[PDB]
Ligand binder design. Sequence first.
Ligand SMILES: [Zn+2]
Lengths: 93, 49, 49, 146, 79, 146, 1117, 97
Amino acid sequence: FFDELRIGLATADDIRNWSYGEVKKPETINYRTLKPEKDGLFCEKIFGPTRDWECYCGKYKRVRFKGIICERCGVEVTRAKVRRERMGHIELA
Amino acid sequence: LIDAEELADRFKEQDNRELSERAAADREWTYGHVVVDEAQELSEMDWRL
Amino acid sequence: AEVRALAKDIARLNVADNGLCFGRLDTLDDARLYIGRLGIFDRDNDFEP
Amino acid sequence: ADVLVPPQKQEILERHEAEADAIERKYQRGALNHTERNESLVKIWQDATEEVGKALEEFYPADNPIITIVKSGATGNLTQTRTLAGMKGLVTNPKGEFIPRPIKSSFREGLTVLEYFINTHGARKGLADTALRTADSGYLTRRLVD
Amino acid sequence: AVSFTLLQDQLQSVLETLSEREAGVVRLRFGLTDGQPRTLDEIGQVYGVTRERIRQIESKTMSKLRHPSRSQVLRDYLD
Amino acid sequence: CYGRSMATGKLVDIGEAVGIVAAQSIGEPGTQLTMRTFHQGGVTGGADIVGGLPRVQELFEARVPRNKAPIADVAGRVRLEESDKFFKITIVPDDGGEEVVYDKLSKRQRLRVITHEDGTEGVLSDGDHVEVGDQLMEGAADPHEV
Amino acid sequence: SVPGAPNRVSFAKLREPLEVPGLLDVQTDSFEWLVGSDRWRQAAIDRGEENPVGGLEEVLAELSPIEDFSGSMSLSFSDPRFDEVKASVDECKDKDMTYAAPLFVTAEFINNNTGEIKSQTVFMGDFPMMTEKGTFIINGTERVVVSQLVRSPGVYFDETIDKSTEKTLHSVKVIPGRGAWLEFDVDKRDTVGVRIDRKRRQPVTVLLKALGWTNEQIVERFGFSEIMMGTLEKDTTSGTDEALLDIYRKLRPGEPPTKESAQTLLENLFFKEKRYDLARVGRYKVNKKLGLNAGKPITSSTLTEEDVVATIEYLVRLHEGQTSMTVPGGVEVPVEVDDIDHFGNRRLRTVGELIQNQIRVGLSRMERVVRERMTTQDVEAITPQTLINIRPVVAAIKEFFGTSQLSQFMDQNNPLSGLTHKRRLSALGPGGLSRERAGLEVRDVHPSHYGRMCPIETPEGPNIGLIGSLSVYARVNPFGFIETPYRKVENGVVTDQIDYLTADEEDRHVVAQANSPTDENGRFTEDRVMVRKKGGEVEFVSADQVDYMDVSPRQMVSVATAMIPFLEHDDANRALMGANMQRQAVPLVRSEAPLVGTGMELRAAIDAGDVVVADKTGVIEEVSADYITVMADDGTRQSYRLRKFARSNHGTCANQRPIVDAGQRVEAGQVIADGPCTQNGEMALGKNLLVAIMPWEGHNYEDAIILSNRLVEEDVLTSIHIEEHEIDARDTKLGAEEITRDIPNVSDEVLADLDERGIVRIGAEVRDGDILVGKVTPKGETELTPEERLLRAIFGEKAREVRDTSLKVPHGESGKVIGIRVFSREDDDELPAGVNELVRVYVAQKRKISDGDKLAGRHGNKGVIGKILPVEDMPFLPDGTPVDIILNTHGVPRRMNIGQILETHLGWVAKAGWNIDVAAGVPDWASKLPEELYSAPADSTVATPVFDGAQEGELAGLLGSTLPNRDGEVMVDADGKSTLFDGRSGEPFPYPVTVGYMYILKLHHLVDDKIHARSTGPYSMITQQPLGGKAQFGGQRFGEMECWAMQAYGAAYTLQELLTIKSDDTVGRVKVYEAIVKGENIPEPGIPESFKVLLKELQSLCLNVEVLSSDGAAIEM
Amino acid sequence: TGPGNRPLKSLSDLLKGKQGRFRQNLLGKRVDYSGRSVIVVGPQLKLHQCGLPKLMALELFKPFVMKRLVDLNHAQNIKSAKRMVERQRPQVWDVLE
Ligand SMILES: [Zn+2]
C-alpha cells in the first residue's frame, strides 16, 4: 500500500495530460434518442463507451477487440465502463 | 428518555451566582422590599428610579 | 439519596459556622431559649433544645 | 429454617420508636420545623437500621448458608441479608427524598400493603435512572476517545 | 460468478468426448472463443468441404452430446 | 516511559494503541460516579458539591472551578485578618521582598486545614508558613493559576 | 360462587365485603354507552340521572340543526338505530369480514319558506360492533382499543423557577375540550400578562377592558394587589373599542381593522358555544376549583366573563402567597397549585369516547359538504338523500380502526395476555403527551395511583410507566375519572356501607388499611391504626379519626399481579418481572392448574372469555370434540361450537376441549369447555414440578436451569406452534402472474407433494426450502448469451417466457400442513387492486423443550435450560423419585425474591396431604388457621391470596404435618429439606437439600426463532450494506465501540476486512468469495471506490493529488 | 438558480455539505459472515473453547464446506455443493467437522 499522499497546484500541462479529449460542444444527448452526442459533455469517444465491448455505431461487439479503436466511431473498445475514471478538459479562449 | 438538546445542556457551564450579587449587577431587577434611610435627601428622580 | 442528604447536611453545617447563635430570650416562666442558625437538640436528654 | 431473624429486633425497634415519639412531641410543642423533624426522624431510623444490621450479623452462625454465601465473597453483601431478614429500612419519595416512616418489616415476614406501595417508588425510579446513567458516561467516553 | 467460468470449462470437458474433426464443427457453428456463428458453408470454407456435410456433422454431434452420459452435470446451470 | 503493559505484564510492544486503551479504561467505570440530578425542576445544582462525574468533566476541560481557591504566589509567612464577610491573607516572602495580598476571599469558605500528625495545627493560623503552590482556602485550585 | 368451581381451600383470614366486579366492564360499559343500549340506559337512570343520552345521540344532537346561511333551509338528525349484525363473529373471522351492523338515523329536511318537511331514514353505513369479549373484528383480525389517559379540560395553576433570574413565576392555563387556549402568567418583573390563542403576550388589563370593564371597575376589583394596579398604570390602552381593536389586530394581523369584526371575534372565540366547549367535565372542574355556581345544575359548558375574572384573581392571590380565596357570590376555595399527574386531573378516554370523537370528526367533515351543496341544488326538490354524503364518516371510522395508534392487534399469546391487554391505560397516543416529551417525571408512581392503577404491572419495553394496568376493583366515573370503593367507618366501627371515591375526593378523608384487626362488631381492637392522609403520607392515627377503609388487601394490585402467591416476600422489581412474564407464557398441549395459587385464577379464567359457559341450566344432550349441544330446562336448545387448532395472533395454538359428559346436568354459568390454557375453568399458565434447591456441577451456574429428560419424554413442556405463510398473484406490466404446478427447471423430487392446483397437499410435512405454492411470473427480453444458447441447443429447451417464484418454507422452519385458505376475485372475494388470487397456508409443528429455551416462575426467577439430564442422573429422593428441575442456591438471596421458596414449601405440603393433630387441643400455631385447613388429602390444591395468605409460622407448622409416602416414610423433614442421592456417583449428598414443588412456565423466547446466521445474502440498494433482521436474512451490526475495541487490540487486518470486505465493497466481496470457493488465498484489499471518487473530484478541482509510496518514493497503482 | 429558487451545487459543494465525503459515520456497518444466538453455560469447555451450533456453523462456513465437498468428489461442481449445503444432505456434517 502507499504510505503518503500530497496535493498541489495543477498546471495546464497536468490537466492536458489527464484529459483523453476536449468537450468542444455543450450538447448532452439527442432529444428523441437517448444516445450521447459527439463532442458533447457525454461524448463516448472522450469518456469511453456506455456499453461494454461496443461503440456508438456498433461495428464491433466482441470481447476480442480489446485494443481496437473503432474506425467510423473513434471509441476505444475498452474492458468495462471506464467512463467512471476517464475525464476530459476544455481549452478556453 | 433524553434528547440531544437536553443532553448537551447537561454538560454546559451552568454558571450560578448568589442572589445578592446576581441582582446587584442587573438594572431591571425588581426587589421584594426597599429600605430607605434619611429619605429626605432623595429627589424626585431618585424616587422615580 | 443518602449521599445527597449527607452532602446537604454538611453544606448546612458549613453555612451555620459563621455566627451560630444570634441571641437569647428569657421567659416569664424563668425558662431560657437560645436562637441560632441551626436547631441543636440533646439526644440523651429527651431532645430538650 | 435457615433465614434466621435476630431476637433483638423488637427491643431495638421500640427503643428507637421512643426517640421518634420524642421528636414528634418536640415538633408539636413548636421547637422544630417540618423538614427538620423529617431529617431527625431519618437520622434516628438510619441508626436503628444500623444497629439491627449489626445484631443480625452477630446472631447468624458462621456455617449458615445465607451468611456463608456473603462472607466468602462469592455473592451478595450484608445489606441484602439485612433487608431479607432484619428490616427493609427507609425508602424514598418520587422526588428522591426519604420518607420519615420506615419499612420496619422484612421480606421474610412480608411487607404490608402500604409499605409495599411506598417501596414501589424507588423500584420504578431505578428503571429510568439506570437508563439515564449511561448517557453521561458515553458522553465522557467519546470525549476521551476523541 | 464461478459457475459461469465452470460452465465454460464444462463445454470443453463435454466436447472432449467428441473427435477433434467433428468437435471443430461444433466450435465453429456455435462460435467457441470467437462468438461468430459460422454458417455451414463457412465451416466448409475453413475445412475445405461442402456445406450440407456441415449440417450432417452438426446433427450427429448434437445427437451424441445430448446423451446423458456426456451432459451429466451441466443441468445444474439451468439459467 | 509507559512501562509494563497492564494486560500482559510485559514491556509494551512498539505499536500499542495505548491512548484508546486509556480512554476506554477511564470511561468504563463512569456509571458508578455520582451525577447531576436528572429532574428538570429545582434550583441550579452548584450550591451542593456534586464531587463526581461533573468534577471529572470540569477537570478534563480545564475550566475554572466553581469553588475556586487561591494559591500562594510566593513562599513566605502568612499574616491573616478577618472582616464582617471577607478574609484577608497576606504573604511576606522570608527570602524575598514585596508582600502579596488576597483581600476578597469570601468568609463562607473555610480556611485550609493542615492538621499535622501530633502538632495538629488544624485550621490555617496566622504566622504559619506556606510554600509556593500551597492552597489557602478550601475548594478546588484553579488549573490555570497553578 | 361459580357452579363448577373446584374446591380450592383458602388461607384467607379476612372476609371480603365486596366481590370482584366484571373485569371486562371497562370496555363493555363504554361501548354500551356509545350505542345507547337499553341496559346502559337503565343502569344510568338508576343513578338518579334523568334522560341519559348516548354517545351517538349526543353527537347527532350537537351536529344538528344545520341551517343554511340565509335561514331558508335546514336539516336535522335524530333517532340512531342499529339492526342485526351481518354475520356472526366466527363467520367474520373465517371469511376475512368486518363484524358490523347497519346504522340508520332519521333525517328531516325543512324549508322555512313554503314550510315543506321531508322526513326519512338515512343509512349511515356499517358501524363496527363490539363482541361479548370486549373486542372488535376488522378484516378478519381481532383488535382491541385501549383506554387513553389524558389531561382533563380543567384550569391548572402552577409555579416554576425562572431560568435567568431564578425567581418564582406563577402561571395559569385554561384547557378546553374543544377550542383555543387561554393562559395568564406573572412575569419575572411582576407584570401580569395574558396570551390568547398561544399568541404574543400582552397585559391582562387589555383583555379586561376588551370585555367591557372600565378602569374604575378594574381598580375596585383588583385594588388589593399592587402589581395589577401597576400593570393598569403602565397599560397604554384606554376604552373598550381600542382594546378590542388591539386584540383583533393581534389575532388577525393581516385583516382590516374593522370594528365589527374586532368585537365579533372575541365573542365567537370563547364565550359562544359554537366553537368553544368544556365538554361538561371541564365545566365541572372549573366550577369546583373556582367555587362558582355551587349547588347549581350544569346548564351550559361555555366560558363566561365571571370565571375569567375569577381565574385572574386566583392567579394574583396565588402569586402573593395567600392560601384561601372567596369570590363574590361564590364559595371559599383554597388557593394552591395543581399537580397534573394527580388522577383528580387525569381522565380516561374509553373506547366509546374515542369512537365518539372520530364520529364527530367525520360528521364535521360531512356538515361542510351538506351546507355547501345546500346552495347548489334546486330548492324544494332536495331530499335528505340527495345531500347526505356518508363517505367521510365511513372513511373516518375505517381509518380509526385500521391506522389509529390505540386500536391494536389483541395480545393473543394466552388468555391472561388478552385479558390484561383489554384493561390497559395508555398515556401515549393522539391528544396525550408528545413523543419526545415523555420524560422520566411523568412515568412515575404518584400516590394517587393507589386502588386505581397497579404500580407493579407495566411493560418492560420503552413504555415503562407510560402504560399501566387497571386495578381489579376500580371503575370509571361517567366523567372519566377512575373511582375505587371504600367502606365507611364511623366512631371506630367498620360499617357495611360502601362508597366509591375518586382520587380528587379521596384526599379529603383519612383511609385506614384493609387488614387492620377488628372485632366481631367491627370496632377496632387497637389504639392506633395506620392510615393514608391528604398528601399520600402514611402515618399512625387514633382509632377515632379514621373515615374510610379499603374493601380488601387486593385493592391496589391488578389481575396479573393478583396471581403471584406470597407477593409480600418479593421485591417490587422482581414482582414486576414475574407479572410481565406471566403474560408471555405459551399454552402447552395439556394444561395443569397450579398446586399453590390464588383465588383470582378462577375468575380471571372466566372473565377472559376463552372458556365456554353454559348460558341456561339444562342437560348436555350431546358432546363431541367439535361441538356441545345443551337442552335447556325450558325446552330451548343451544349449540356451542368449539374452536380447534386455531392460530392466535402470535402463532400459539388456541385449542379448546370439552369437560362435560353426555347426560350431565350443568347449571347456568358453569364452565363446559376448557380454554386454550386453563384446566377446569381456571388459569393453568404453567406446570408444577419437583424442584431441588442446590448447585449441581455448575450446569445451573449464573441463573441457568437443569431439566430431567422426563419432561421431554412425557411432553410435559411441549407446545404446538402454527405459522401462516401467504402469497398472491398480481397483475404486472408484462401481464398477470399465474399459479401452476409446471414450474420450470425442478425435479419431480421437489414437487411430489403438490396438488393439481399447485398448492401443497394438506397433511404433508415440509422442511425449509420445500415448495408450498407453485407460482410463475412473466419475464422480459431474453437475449441469451452464446453459452446459454449452447445449453438450450444441447438440452432441446423449447422457448418459454416464465420464471419461478414459488413460495417456499423459510430458513429453519418445518412442520405439517394443517390448512389452506384461498381467495380469488373471480369468486367475488375482495382483493387488493391488481391481484387475482391469494393463498394462505398453515404449517403446524410440535416443539419440545430444548436447550436455550427460557423458563421462569411467577416470582421473577427466570433462566435458560443449559442442560437436560438423563432420568438416572438426576438426584432422587430416598424412595427413588427423581427431581424434575434443579435451581441454583446463589440466585435466591441477592434477588430478594424469597417468595419462590415459600411457593416451593407450600407446593410440597399440597402435593402430600397434611393432618394437624387435635388430640390435645389445636396447636398454638394453628389458632388462626380456618378449620377447613386442619386436614387434606394428597394433591389438594390450596389458595394463598397476595396480601392475605399463609403465614410463616403456619407454613412452618404445616411442613411437619405432611402425610407419609407409599411406604410410610416421610421424605421431607420439618425444615423442608430432604436427603438426596447422587444419580451419577450413587453416594448420598452430605447435607439435606431443600425439596418441593414449584410452578414454572414456558416463556415465548424459544431458541428456535432466535438463532441466526449469514455468510452471504441480500444487500440494501440504498446504502449497499447487508440487510438487517432475521426475516431479511441480514447481518450483525458492528458499531463504533466494536471498532474501538478492535483498535485497542491492534488487530488492523481484521478491522480492515470487517469494514471493507464484509461491508459495502462489491468487487472485494466477490473476489473474496471466489478465492474462498476456489481455494486461493484471500486477495489483499485496497483503494475503495469512495477514495477513488474523492480523488477524482479533487482532481476536478484542479488539485494535483497523487499517492506516493514509502517515506518519499514514487507513485503506484 | 435555474428552475425554482434552488441554487446549483458547485464542485466544491461535493465536499462541504452534510452529505459527501471527508465524513465519519457514528452508526456501524452490518457485516457478512456473522451470526447470533442464545448463550448457555458450558462447564466442560476449556478457557479457549466455545460450543457452536451445527446449523449456525454450517451457514457461517458454507463456502469452505462447498470447497471441501468438491475436493472430496462428493459434489461434481460448486453448484452441486451449494445445493447440498442448502438442503443439508447427510455428508455435509462429515466435512463440517
Ligand atoms: Zn463505432
